[PDB]
Amino acid sequence: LNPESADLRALAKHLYDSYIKSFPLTKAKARAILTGKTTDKSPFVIYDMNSLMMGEDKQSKEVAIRIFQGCQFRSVEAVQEITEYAKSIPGFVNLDLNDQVTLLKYGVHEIIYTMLASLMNKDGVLISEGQGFMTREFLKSLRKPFGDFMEPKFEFAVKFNALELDDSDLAIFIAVIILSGDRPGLLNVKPIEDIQDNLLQALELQLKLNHPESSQLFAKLLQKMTDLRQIVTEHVQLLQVIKKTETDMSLHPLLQEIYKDLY
């Protein structure tokens, strides 16, 4: 290790520590829960309407809506955690505040679906901080339009999880996503690109040191950033459909704010 590499290791560590502070349920813990390698009770499995209702004992709108709005509630909490994490990225809070807002607005869902993969396997997803496991099949079975809203997220996840990143890798990756200089409407791109340049260098070194056997992991990971955007744009279209067809529902105000003039 040389002095520039050292500064990059320090940045990696600083981000890892902020990540652990900001995000209560890590991929480490999630994996422990999913494999069974934990001394906690295994999670309650939700695979049908009945199991759901018995698990709720751990509103009274229809099931698909209750599930969809539980996802909204989780995002709202996730946005708060991501906002706190973003504030720890060196140089972030020194940006024009309008640009901080724009970066968060466009970054949060990409990060949400990234971190959701940490909680997923090919059969289902941990919920309620790992106290539950909701099956992929059950989510597929929901009545249209809700029946296939999770499928693109699971398909992304199985591919993304094959990279076998850990929390120390994810912490840098997430910061890279937030510091994207090509978000629409940014006022001053230069200081954002300067920060992202450093982060990307930090990520590349991190991946070389933590995964020395996995050649071109850095390049595979950068291509996923493009796939995350697709997940978000498609989701926006699904939301448009849902907003037209289900005037039962109401989007949480934080989410209205994020989604307004997003794509």
Partner: peptide, 11 residues
């Protein structure tokens, strides 16, 4: 616009 995010950022 972005009243909440502003708030979370400045908090």
């Amino acid at each position: 616009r972005h009243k909440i995010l502003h708030r979370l950022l400045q908090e």
